Design a protein around this ligand. Structure first.
Ligand SMILES: Nc1ncnc2c1ncn2[C@@H]1O[C@H](COP(=O)(O)OP(=O)(O)OP(O)(O)=S)[C@@H](O)[C@H]1O
Ligand SMILES: Nc1ncnc2c1ncn2[C@@H]1O[C@H](COP(=O)(O)OP(=O)(O)OP(O)(O)=S)[C@@H](O)[C@H]1O
Ligand SMILES: Nc1ncnc2c1ncn2[C@@H]1O[C@H](COP(=O)(O)OP(=O)(O)OP(O)(O)=S)[C@@H](O)[C@H]1O
Ligand SMILES: [Mg+2]
Ligand SMILES: [Mg+2]
Ligand SMILES: [Mg+2]
Ligand SMILES: [Zn+2]
Ligand SMILES: [Zn+2]
Ligand SMILES: [Zn+2]
Ligand SMILES: [Zn+2]
Lengths: 360, 35, 343, 334, 368, 367
């Protein structure tokens, strides 16, 4: 049966996971030395390997060949965990199991020995959704549980949990994956999938991933569906609404030089062409940052913008740094309020007019 | 008032002033406070 | 069809008992004492039965019908009391009451206690039928202006001596709680048999146990007496009343005042009052509130109210009472720079 | 629901993925109101549940098609908020997930439609996350939302996002002209007002919203010279207050753009009102009032049960305060 | 265990009751004259003698001698009441007895005659928590109780109780014992137990009790524990410092007087206490708001708080409106920016420094 | 293999680090025999409320008698140590929050203890009990049976009713000092025969605010990361906090208005692979420390002593107003970091804001 790239390429060993070297090393060393805790909380942004790392740790603990740092993935228990069948690996959703009876039976069945494995792993997802009474009741279990149960906790944000929970759990901060790691993983996946890919497309997808690899895979699947089974630069640009042209620079120049009619015409034609407005704001922010950098250090400018070098240089010679900071601040304010505006076009126009109000 | 102050206000910078000196005591030897 | 008051009800009972009695009002002490006096007069007349029932859809009526259609085995000429529901009679209760009036018997002495009926509820078949032999005793709680005279009369009836200071202290401590006021008077009489109650005497043996309503707080803010507004806010806070109803009641009058002030630039006040159909007794109060504050106020007040609502139902904090008392002081003739209140 | 012509291409694309068996289980349609995303989702579900589909369209006579017409298919477990409410609870998601947890009665494919993921509760979305991550075989989800940013980051991550772009401006204008008999200027004003999404403009024309907009414009025209903005409350206090606030914001934006110099304005149908508003107010005042109006509209939309008239009159009083000379005008800042 | 002072020193006679002179005199007159009301309501605050006075009334009303205001304390009834095992002394709590079934059972049991007591006294506690059904049942049974039963209600917030209960009940709201009475009682208790103490320690304990004798007894027991069988000024002062939770007011005072080292010391103490920093900022902001309102109107300071009344009054009268305004604005800005501060502790310290030794440049409304 | 927190739980009054006042009070009470019937313990997480409560329970029920120095070898002591003591009733407030459950709990209070001399009750997070539960518990708290002791515990004591507070002896445990945490970590690591470095212990103690349990958890995580050893590099990498020297050099470059050094330092940080928000937080912390040093002389702990002198220079040369300006600029940049196109871009733009608005040496203003 066909599966999406996120499900197809879920890591099955501690070597298939990309990034998060520190937490993986800590887990492997703990498993090797036998110093294993009873509460592993994983904190980080979405699409960084919370569930993947938790399942890998569960496989390592429950492997039939003893506690192994890198589970083989072929045992009966290993395969069942990989398929989400292992009874001793209870995957609980915090939001669903918020009622009193749910937690009461959760802490009442701990005494029963594991059915198959040597540890009755409890993988609780988005633990921050549990009620305060749930945390209070589970403190005792999280402190001194029996030596047959391990609690694996996953939450997008750890600060919302009670301080006691953080005290009783080993916290692993999954770092957001950088652009290079996402690009390398996408390149490897596409090569193993026998799908042609261009470096520009991979770079754009990694940039749009915003640090989450699941989002990168979802964008790749979207491009595949729209790109007639081909990861082409033009298809990815059309899907993502990336200008990658001089329109952003011209609009920034118009904004700095007031001339509201030019800015309005540029926005009108951009809307007619149907682009992504968040992409336009990000491009403007990048251009303003580059202008500030060249004002500080002229050598900090690349050659990709060579065709627009001199004009850009003119801004670095014409706009004082304080005005650049003001424009960047206004663009960021527009970025923050763009989702909440009545319309995306209205938000962009308000941001640009506010920036236009500023002048020497 | 000045361009500096107006820009800092627009950026959200409070520009805290001293007003009540003397409270700053200890190993403080600020000869030139730029004021 | 005689409308009377509990103060003079004793003479009415003495001259002769009436077939139908009904006590309407909100004052608890006045209702209780009127009921006790009527029951004692009935017992002296020779009525030994004192049946009491509470009107409610859950409660049945077969027992009431049987007792009204039957005497007592070891007594005669029963007396029946009906406790009306707080909201008031509904259609089913109206049918029950007219049925009771249909088979009402002279030997039965009817007493009714509950909140005072409204104009719409005033007219009814059973009420009109009983009007031929109905004596209704108004039992409303006297206003703040009427409180000092009432307490002075109460003390004089008790052979005590109260000065102006003691009367003011009693009014302040037991405003709207006349039952506690009478209990305090009895306690002071017991403590000092001499009967002379000076300011130290009363002040050393009293407690703040007044009860209020949000309308009283809004009235206090309109008048502008800061002490009364703070006292009523404290009493409501201690009573556990939620601030939502206070905020809504304040908001209604605030919007009315804003509209009147803005539209009074070139329009007579009388026409606006007539159009708005506001209470006649409140015309002068609204005029005083309008001329006491100018358009510079009624603007930070609305913004303060909005901030209070936001901090209430978004932050879910407990500092709502502080904001309420700040707004109370603002509505009075006070500077209230509003920097503290973030108006 | 209605199937608009501009849904023809995108549908023909999406179904093609399902024609190859590579369709994404979780689909999130980013479409503005009036774009007919509901019709697209219904057509996709009909194609998926058809027993003997031909080409792209469903046969229309197999058992699946008959059940779809009757609206009693054992599969096709739709999620929507209660009629008397405006949000979807976690219990509905729980029961729908439990129903999806087993095989389809017809033996084909199971479809789940979330009418509006924006209304989905945080707990409900978090519960749906698990079933969305690894749906059972032949299980398909069709979410919908105007602003995917408002959704949770995780939920947006799970889904494959498809953006239903609106038609060309001229195409929408001519479609509305063929539909509604009204001056082309009004049609263009409605289209620009509705973010250039036909259908939403058609819905606005069908209801009394157009008369409300005209009344609000007349009230603002009377208020701007005299400065008595409080009267605007009379034309603003209504159950559709957010829409009226959006109309006022668009009018202010048009006036500000006219001040800065522009060739096109959203409220093209009222050049005189825009000109008067731009002339009688300075750009700083226009910006401050527009920001305040947008903030209050956002507060009204997001906050539940907020006292509408209180917020509106507070906004009016603050606007009147801003017009007074020498008053510091607030500026937006995160 | 040597018992505890609160349990040992329960007043077993009216003569040894501290304060509450008016209530004591009223009860003595009622018992002597033979006039006893159907129900009694003792209200006030905690640790003032509501339960103690109720038990004194119960034992004096059912004493073998008769209805006397000076119970012997040696008969079977008095001794049983003192031991808290008298069958007719039916002590119940509205906490776990608000159920319809439990209230119905109590009402049914009321009719039965006392086992060996002249009156079957019901000592109900926290009556303000009774549900509407239970409250109505209590009112109905109090409308005309049997002559052999009595009700001694002991609440703590009469405002919750509607006046209907007062319509058939006599109230004896107690008052705060005041510092002098508490200090004298503590001195008597310590002397009677051959416990060494200093007058300043007793003064500190009485002032810290905050008008509650039970609190004073607990505090002096703590002093004995930490003092090693002897109350001393240093021991009680250290105990108070450990237990003190008024860091917000002290910080406000230090900011008012611009005592930087005092502010640092108070912040360190709060960190040792480990109080939530945003909560501390909110408390300080509320204190500043209360100071401003007190300056606006003296009545703004409610009587609900009395331990910091003098401090609040002196701060309100001393500082001008402008300084308190500046403090409030700086604290508000600090609270708003606290989430983005490098640390909650660092954010609190920074906002305190800004308030005490800085001032924000206000914006200018540039002409149009 | 067992967790450090569980293995190194105190087993005698001596083992407890800090909290001298409560330990002395309890020891004196047990020795003199003046034992109260209701003790409330308060503080922050991990300070040792439960440890002290269990030590008191051991002292009360010890076979040798009631003493402040329990033997630790008799059956009662071993059972309490293992958490399998019948009379020591460990109750959770959240488990029984309704009035009915607490009434059921109190129904069995009258019965005599099984084998222990007292029927000690230890309620965890007592503040979670409802108001009705508190009121029901009041009567038993005032006059409990002579063989019954209550040991309440809660992180937030302000939620309790005033009656409950007055009915029991309060003991507010204080957050442990950083030096105490470091000493405890060093002692346990030495007992376990584990290599460690002073800087790593200082970093761990700083990470654990006042909760020794967090210190032990972080120490265990560092043990895992370092493969059985606690090295400064491993702890620094795990915490994600770069060395203070780099942030100090960054702020020195920022104040000097030389952007080349700032660019070089941020490039080196990027090469090191350190999250940018941590760098910004460190810069803000350094600025705050400088401001505090300006306010008072003794504002820097001994942990920063290695770089104290240099820091003091920045206090003397840099005025306070521009220190506040830099602090505000960095704080607003951190406010804007999430919405920036990139974390590196956000930090770069914040530093450029700081340099452009530099008071002493503003960046050049070309027309
Ligand atoms: N660190 C990673 N290494 C390798 N693949 C990853 C990683 N993070 C995410 N993925 C991919 O994304 C899929 C789903 O992401 P997850 O592993 O569940 O991360 P996640 O943090 O658990 O997502 P959330 O928090 O539940 S939204 C996996 O099956 C992988 O294909
Ligand atoms: N007026 C008093 N005179 C002497 N001792 C008192 C007095 N009030 C309290 N005490 C002491 O404090 C102990 C407990 O006092 P209580 O009478 O229970 O306080 P309380 O009014 O019952 O508080 P509540 O009703 O439970 S909130 C008594 O056993 C005495 O030792
Ligand atoms: N004061 C202390 N003395 C010695 N070790 C301590 C101390 N506080 C904490 N520890 C250590 O940290 C562990 C946890 O201590 P606990 O007392 O269980 O934490 P806790 O305070 O009971 O948790 P809370 O307050 O309910 S969140 C102990 O087993 C010790 O190893
Ligand atoms: Mg996951
Ligand atoms: Mg009591
Ligand atoms: Mg604990
Ligand atoms: Zn295996
Ligand atoms: Zn078909
Ligand atoms: Zn006796
Ligand atoms: Zn022992």
């Amino acid at each position: 049966s066909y599966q999406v790239l996120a499900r197809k390429w879920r890591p099955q060993t501690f070597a298939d996971v990309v990034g998060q070297e520190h937490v993986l090393t800590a887990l492997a060393n703990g498993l090797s030395l036998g110093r294993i805790h009873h509460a592993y909380l994983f904190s980080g942004t979405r699409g960084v390997g919370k569930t993947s790392i938790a399942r890998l740790l569960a496989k390592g603990l429950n492997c039939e060949t003893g506690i192994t740092a890198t589970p083989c993935g072929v045992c009966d228990n290993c395969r069942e965990i990989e398929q989400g069948r292992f009874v001793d690996l209870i995957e609980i959703d915090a939001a669903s199991r918020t009622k009193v009876e749910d937690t009461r039976d959760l802490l009442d069945n701990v005494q029963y020995a594991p059915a198959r494995g040597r540890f009755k792993v409890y993988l609780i997802d988005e633990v921050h959704m549990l009620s305060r009474h749930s945390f209070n009741a589970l403190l005792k279990t999280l402190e001194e549980p029996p030596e047959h149960v391990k609690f694996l906790l996953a939450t997008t944000d750890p600060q919302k949990l009670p301080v006691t929970i953080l005290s009783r759990c080993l916290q692993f901060h999954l770092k957001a994956l950088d652009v290079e790691q996402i690009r390398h993983q996408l390149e490897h996946i596409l090569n193993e999938e026998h799908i042609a890919h261009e470096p520009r497309a991979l770079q754009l997808l990694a940039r749009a991933a915003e640090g989450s690899l699941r989002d990168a895979l979802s964008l790749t699947d979207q491009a595949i569906a729209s790109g007639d089974g081909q990861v082409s630069t033009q298809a990815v640009s059309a899907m993502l609404g990336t200008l990658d042209d001089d329109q952003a620079l011209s609009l920034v120049e118009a904004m700095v030089e007031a001339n509201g009619e030019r800015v309005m015409a540029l926005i009108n034609e951009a809307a007619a062409r149907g682009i992504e407005w968040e992409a336009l704001l990000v491009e403007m922010l990048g251009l303003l940052h580059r202008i500030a950098m060249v004002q500080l250090s002229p050598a900090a400018l690349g050659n990709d913008m060579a065709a627009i070098e001199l004009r850009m240089r003119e801004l670095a010679r014409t706009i004082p740094p304080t005005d650049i900071q003001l424009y960047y601040q206004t663009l960021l304010i527009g970025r923050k309020e763009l989702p909440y505006a009545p319309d995306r076009r209205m938000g962009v126009e308000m941001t640009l007019l506010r920036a236009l109000a500023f002048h020497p | 008032t000045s361009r500096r102050d107006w820009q800092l206000q627009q950026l959200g910078i409070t520009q805290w002033s001293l007003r009540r000196p003397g409270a700053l005591q200890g190993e403080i030897a600020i000869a030139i406070p730029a004021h | 069809m005689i409308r009377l008051y509990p103060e003079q009800l004793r003479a009415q009972l003495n001259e002769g008992l009436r077939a139908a009695y009904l006590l309407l009002g909100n004052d608890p002490l006045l209702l209780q004492e009127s009921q006790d006096a009527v029951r004692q007069v009935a017992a002296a007349q020779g009525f030994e039965e004192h049946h009491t029932f509470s009107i409610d859809p859950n409660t049945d009526w077969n027992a009431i019908f049987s007792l009204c259609q039957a005497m007592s085995l070891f007594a005669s000429r029963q007396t029946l009391l009906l406790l009306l529901p707080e909201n008031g009679p509904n259609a089913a209760i109206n049918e029950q009451l007219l049925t009771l009036t249909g088979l009402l018997h002279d030997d039965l002495l009817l007493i009714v206690r509950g909140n005072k009926l409204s104009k719409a509820q005033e007219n009814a078949a059973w009420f009109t039928a009983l009007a031929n032999r109905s004596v209704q005793v108004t039992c409303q709680t006297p206003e703040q202006a009427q409180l000092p005279r009432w307490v002075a009369a109460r003390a004089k009836q008790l052979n005590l001596e109260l000065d102006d200071a003691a009367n003011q202290v009693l009014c302040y401590c037991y405003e709207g709680n006349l039952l506690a006021l009478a209990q305090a008077l009895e306690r002071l009489s017991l403590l000092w048999p001499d009967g002379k109650l000076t300011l130290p005497r009363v002040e050393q043996a009293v407690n703040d146990a007044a009860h209020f309503t949000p309308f009283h707080w809004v009235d206090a803010l309109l008048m502008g007496k800061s002490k009364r507004a703070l006292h009523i806010l404290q009493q409501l806070r201690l009573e556990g009343s939620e601030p939502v109803i206070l905020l809504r009641t304040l908001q209604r009058e605030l919007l009315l005042l804003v509209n009147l002030k803005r539209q009074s630039a070139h329009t007579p006040l009388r026409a606006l009052f007539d159009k708005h159909r506001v209470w006649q007794n409140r015309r002068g109060m609204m005029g005083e509130a309008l001329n006491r504050l100018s358009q510079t106020q009624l603007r930070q007040a609305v913004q303060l109210l909005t901030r209070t609502e936001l901090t209430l139902k978004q932050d879910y904090g407990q500092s709502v009472w502080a904001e309420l008392e700040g707004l109370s002081l603002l509505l009075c003739h006070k500077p209230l720079a509003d920097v503290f209140i973030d108006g | 629901m209605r199937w608009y012509p501009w849904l023809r291409p995108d549908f023909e694309k999406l179904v093609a993925s399902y024609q190859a068996g590579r369709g994404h289980h979780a689909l999130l349609i980013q479409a503005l109101p009036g774009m007919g995303d509901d019709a697209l989702i219904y057509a996709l579900s009909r194609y998926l549940l058809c027993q003997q589909p031909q080409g792209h369209k469903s046969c229309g006579h197999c058992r699946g098609c008959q059940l779809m017409q009757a609206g009693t298919h054992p599969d096709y477990y739709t999620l929507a908020p209660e009629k008397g409410k405006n949000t979807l609870g976690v219990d509905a998601v729980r029961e729908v997930t439990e129903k999806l947890n087993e095989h389809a009665r017809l033996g084909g494919a199971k479809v789940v439609w979330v009418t509006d993921a924006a209304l989905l509760t945080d707990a409900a979305a978090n519960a749906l996350l698990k079933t969305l991550e690894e749906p059972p075989a032949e299980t398909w989800f069709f979410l919908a939302t105007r602003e995917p940013e408002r959704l949770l980051a995780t939920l947006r991550s799970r889904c494959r996002l498809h953006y239903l772009a609106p038609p060309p401006e001229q195409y929408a204008v001519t479609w509305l002209s063929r539909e509604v008999t009204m001056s082309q200027d009004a049609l263009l004003a409605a289209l620009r007002l509705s973010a250039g999404s036909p259908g939403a403009a058609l819905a606005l024309f069908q209801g009394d919203n157009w008369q409300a907009r005209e009344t609000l414009c007349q009230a603002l025209a009377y208020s701007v010279p005299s400065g008595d903005w409080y009267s605007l409350l009379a034309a603003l206090n209504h159950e559709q207050a957010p829409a009226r606030l959006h109309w006022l914001a668009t009018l202010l934006m048009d006036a500000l753009k006219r001040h800065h110099g522009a060739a096109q304005v959203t409220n093209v149908d009222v050049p005189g009102l825009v000109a008067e508003l731009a002339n009688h107010l300075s750009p700083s005042r226009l910006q401050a009032i527009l920001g305040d109006v947008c903030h209050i509209r956002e507060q009204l939309m997001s906050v539940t049960g907020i006292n509408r008239e209180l917020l509106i009159t507070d906004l009016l009083l603050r606007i009147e305060h801003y017009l007074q000379p020498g008053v510091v005008l607030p500026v937006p800042h995160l």
